[PDB]
Amino acid sequence: SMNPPPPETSNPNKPKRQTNQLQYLLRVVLKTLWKHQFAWPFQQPVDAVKLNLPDYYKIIKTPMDMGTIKKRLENNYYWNAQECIQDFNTMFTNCYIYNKPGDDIVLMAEALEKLFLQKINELPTEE
Numbered sequence: 001s002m003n004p005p006p007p008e009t010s011n012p013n014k015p016k017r018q019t020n021q022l023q024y025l026l027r028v029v030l031k032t033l034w035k036h037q038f039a040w041p042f043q044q045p046v047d048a049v050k051l052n053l054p055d056y057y058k059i060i061k062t063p064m065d066m067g068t069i070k071k072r073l074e075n076n077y078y079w080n081a082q083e084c085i086q087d088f089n090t091m092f093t094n095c096y097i098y099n100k101p102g103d104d105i106v107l108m109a110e111a112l113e114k115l116f117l118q119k120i121n122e123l124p125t126e127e
């Protein structure tokens, strides 16, 4: 009626596997971002109805969030680390497209992206 359905988090037609990189993505990358002071707005899809943002899902056509990412990791939805890293990048990029520089939500996203890029830089070799 207003919010779209969320991005897919299970589908037996999607190829998937477990890898050491995807396991790092969950144990290190996601859990470090999740517990941060500024994580809360990113922990579930944007609720455009609650927020009175009738333009959000006209502007953001590939929504993403960390709740979605957590479910995709916990359900082993991904084929590789690059797909998961793409989701994080989409989440951050969406935030910056929709909001103004120096908006609180952007400063919050920036703080989390800084941490994300630190953890990604130590993505271990596929083993």
Ligand SMILES: Cc1noc(C)c1-c1ccc2c(c1)[C@H](c1ccccc1)N(C)C2=O
Pocket: 041, 042, 046, 047, 051, 053, 094, 095, 098, 099, 104, 105
């Ligand atoms: C993430 C995200 N990308 O664009 C928007 C808009 C959001 C977004 C997602 C959720 C919320 C808020 C904003 C918003 C808010 C405004 C300012 C600072 C912090 C939180 N609030 C009250 C929420 O529960």
